[PDB]
Symmetry: C2
Subunit: 601 residues, 2 copies
């Protein structure tokens, strides 16, 4: 649209120039006009649209139908929308006229060769930005955005189904391209984070893709081995980190090098912009696909129970140093493919890998919230939850490189949580998310010593104060309620959880009606918190199915009081509760229906 190029003509000899199919050319004179010039005419061959326009005013007016009065502020604009078949097969002639001489005072001839040069990719502009207004040099976020998407499989076999396509259309006379260079280039910065293979030869061969744009390879002269269309495959090599915005740009430049005694000069430049697909976490509220477990010779009942739960949930089960402590499952998305990526600090053919080593703990310190709205901002991919450490602590629970990575994804702005009060220190010990039909589409389950205190008091006042826990050393409800140290420590734990409750309500925009307090007691090991009875909140969420650790609570009228309380709290929301014996894992999930490129961060 806005591209225009100046080409000057000489009265003493013809000029010859190359023009691009889209770009319009300003045709001015190099030197004085004839002596008594008062008027001028412009003529052109079929296919060269000529227009007159004041240089101050917008709007074009046709030129080849009238003799115009000479004005220095008038611009002649030439457009060739169609490429040329032979060099200089079109021309323009400016004739200068006086009111006295019948014949023209002087001719100025400009022969033109039209070439069509275009570098394009998959811009992902279905219904987001009305095309023909897409600045190819930009990548725009939001539902009104556009731009190329680039995936990253690992941070030379047949694995190009994840690479992005890049088409270089160069339609023009062949002879022109033994005089003019076509340089595909990229910055030294972008070269270290992505590579480009040009296909040269049969498409079926695996080594026909030549490594043309690499780590030190920042420029490459493109040979037109396939006529007027060359194909490149772009492979992303780095995820966005603290020092990488995620944008990768490639340019094509046409270089006039015809003048042997002069220097080469640019004629045209086209650009495509790829953004690296961020790594997105999957909350518990998403549908599962494959559960991954690691078992031993004695853990043969937990696996049977989790397999039964996966069967009832439609999910599939696979068996396999921990898959839930040193390993996280997320996904990268692109219009043509969604690839699950593992983050580490084997499990599938369609699986990518990413890792960051510290520059100098466990991944239970990382969770993710369902989509929320808070502080006016909308988080349609949810927010990451990072259990940090208290200011001034010696040990660090999450390395700085992982924090930088998660913040550089920026599609799930993280929230720090207080977990130093726990023995292990995982957020799943006190926090969970389950699907709910009404409300915000889910419920946030928080461990609550206060809820268990209230329930035990209610059961004691109902005469069942002597019911025993750990029935299937046992302890009664009365002995727990009368243990002053236990109750006071659980009040402290309740306040610790209240801090996180307020933080989560503020940052996730949650209301009290969105929270459910699961009764859960704790004890001290060692000056930190561990579960008194098996942690009910640290459950497994497979859609509407819940694998809840069996608490072995008091037995009243032949039913576990804690199991029945958790049923009373969770079943009216459509979930089916299963209590798994773990006293005697990771889930891969489906991507969000919301596309991350539609988000405006």
């Amino acid at each position: 649209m806005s591209l225009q190029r100046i080409v000057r003509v000489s009265l003493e000899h013809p000029t010859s120039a190359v023009c691009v199919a889209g770009v319009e050319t300003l045709v001015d004179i190099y030197g004085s006009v004839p002596e008594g010039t008062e008027m001028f005419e412009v003529y052109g061959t079929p296919g060269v649209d000529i227009y007159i326009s004041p240089n101050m005013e917008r709007g074009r007016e046709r030129a080849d139908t009238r003799r115009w009065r000479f004005d220095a502020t008038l611009e002649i604009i030439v457009v060739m929308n169609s490429p040329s078949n032979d060099l200089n097969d079109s021309h323009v002639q400016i004739s200068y006229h006086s009111s006295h001489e019948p014949l023209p005072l002087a001719y100025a001839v400009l022969y033109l060769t039209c070439v069509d040069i275009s570098l394009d990719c998959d811009l992902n502009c279905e219904g987001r930005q009305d095309r023909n207004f897409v600045d190819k040099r930009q990548w725009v976020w939001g539902p009104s955005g556009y731009g190329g998407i680039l995936l990253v499989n690992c941070d030379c076999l047949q694995d190009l189904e994840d690479m992005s396509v890049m088409v270089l259309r160069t339609q023009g006379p062949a002879a022109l391209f033994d005089d003019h260079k076509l340089v595909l280039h990229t910055s030294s910065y972008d070269a270290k984070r992505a590579q480009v293979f040009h296909i040269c030869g049969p498409e079926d061969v695996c080594e026909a893709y030549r490594h043309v744009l690499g780590q030190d390879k920042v420029s490459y002269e493109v040979p037109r081995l396939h006529g007027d269309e060359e194909r490149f495959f772009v492979e992303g090599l780095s995820f966005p980190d603290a020092g990488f915005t995620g944008l990768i740009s490639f340019h094509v430049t046409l270089l006039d090098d015809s003048n042997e005694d002069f220097s080469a000069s640019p004629i045209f430049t086209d650009t495509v912009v790829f953004r690296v697909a961020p790594w997105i976490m999957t909350p518990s509220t998403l549908p599962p696909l494959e559960v991954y477990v690691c078992r031993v010779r004695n853990n043969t009942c937990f696996v049977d129970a989790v397999a039964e739960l996966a069967r009832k949930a439609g999910c599939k089960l696979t068996i396999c140093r921990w898959i839930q402590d040193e390993m996280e499952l997320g996904y990268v998305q692109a219009p043509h493919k969604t690839l699950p990526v593992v983050f580490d600090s084997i499990l599938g053919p369609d699986f990518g890998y990413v890792t960051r080593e510290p520059r100098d703990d466990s991944f239970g310190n990382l969770e993710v919230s369902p989509p929320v709205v808070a502080n006016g901002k909308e988080y349609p991919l949810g927010r990451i939850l990072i259990g940090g450490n208290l200011p001034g602590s010696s040990g660090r629970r999450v390395t700085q490189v992982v924090r930088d990575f998660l913040h550089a994804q920026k599609v799930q702005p993280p929230v720090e949580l207080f977990v130093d009060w726990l023995a292990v220190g995982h957020v799943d010990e006190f926090l969970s998310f389950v699907p709910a039909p009404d409300g915000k589409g889910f419920r946030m389950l928080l461990a609550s010593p206060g809820a268990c205190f209230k329930l035990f008091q209610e059961k004691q006042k109902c005469g069942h104060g002597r019911a025993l826990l750990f029935q299937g050393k046992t302890i009664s409800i009365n002995q727990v309620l009368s243990n002053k140290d236990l109750i006071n420590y659980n009040k402290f734990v309740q306040s610790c959880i209240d801090w996180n409750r307020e933080v989560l309500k503020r940052e996730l925009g949650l209301a009290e009606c969105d929270i459910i307090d699961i009764p859960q007691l704790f004890k001290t090991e060692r000056k930190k918190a561990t579960a008194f009875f098996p942690d009910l909140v640290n459950m497994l969420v497979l859609g509407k199915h819940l694998g809840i650790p069996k608490p072995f609570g008091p037995i009243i009228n032949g039913c576990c009081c804690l199991e029945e309380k958790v049923r009373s709290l969770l079943e009216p929301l459509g979930l089916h509760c299963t209590f798994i014996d773990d006293f005697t894992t990771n889930v891969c999930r489906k991507p969000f229906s919301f596309k991350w490129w539609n988000m405006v961060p």
Copy 2:
């Protein structure tokens, strides 16, 4: 919006610390009494108690009525004033039944109020009325706010005039602070790019400023050595680069560590956010302050002429321009000129970047283009052709300039030149009408036209280089010279179109200065002294004297450039350089008001 939950027990009194601003939700830990139907809430003077449904907003006073018991009701406690002694305030929740006259049970919460606030200069004079300022955010634009942090050196006698102040107000009972920690902290990332010195003792002493937040020092327990106010001085250590957004954050955290058998727990956190002041270039259209020259045993007339020009322009003269640029960093309390390299230090900062293995850099006056507004102008970088082996501008410098983010740069085509500087063909002069300036471009076509006009007027035999000499006719009839200058004109036309597009310039904003060229080694050098490569001191212009044709006793090229530049109020002086850097005043526009 901050709120903190504190639970009370029916069997024993609870005790808590509350922050002056924050409101506390007071709930019960455990069941309510047996036949509870109503409740009352009472508090000491200075403890505002409110009742509110947990689903609905809006508070209602609490200590004037007996309410019906509802689990969804929240009791909110506010203590806007600090306490003098521990637990000098208290709240009492009494539970009532319609049968027992006396309350069923009391729940007592003793409260001690402390006031903790970490503040800096938020720069919110008339942009945001400070009641909506999120201290955890730094917002660009004319409706923005946030702390500014300057950088004096990017590679302790009296250099605290450039550091930013940071006040920690901690007003409360002294005993409280032998049980609770005050931790001032920052990330390991930000710690490597800024430092913080706590002042402890007399202001006149040089070693009273203790290095408390450093490169590996990411946390520091603050002693209340001055009562209820501690002072810290923050010094920025790094400019924004490709891997640094320029934001530095410091937090204060109150840690309850009273429970010996339990773990420490957070109570309150406050934050201040500093942004590093970007490095801003100064275009030729800004008023000069001090010209800097480097001389030799010869060239004593050029220096005298430059001194006369500086004198007539009000500027000062002191005794380069390559591998060295002069810009400025700005903050509401100080503007410091910073030199970027690849005499002394009176109010002068320093920055350098070594490659990972400056005539090529200029800057435009403020412009508007493509809908965007560039009130600090745009940087102009003469780059290299894509297929060229050598690089004229290193990648680290490009990353630095793009990270400054306040003058988005524009690449220019300069490989056709022998040296390759943008000032060889490009200049900016102030103009009264139109926009704030005119863009001077070297034009072989203009000189061709002028020589043709002078030849048709009979003066075709006037000789250049008179005061080796060549006539107008010999130049016009030199076919190789004219063709090469046409090529040079097209090379400059490429840059003209790029500049018009990226700077939003019109043809009426451009002036073509007649300038011929010749070939040194396949590249371009000035035929006669380059007229466009001039010195701009306000309305005064030091133009390299062209030894062109003399017609009627006056140089036709000098008179042509006068005809072109004097009707704009400029005064032209032609200095003999055939036989420098300028420090300028900052933009009136403040960079923090820009929205990039």
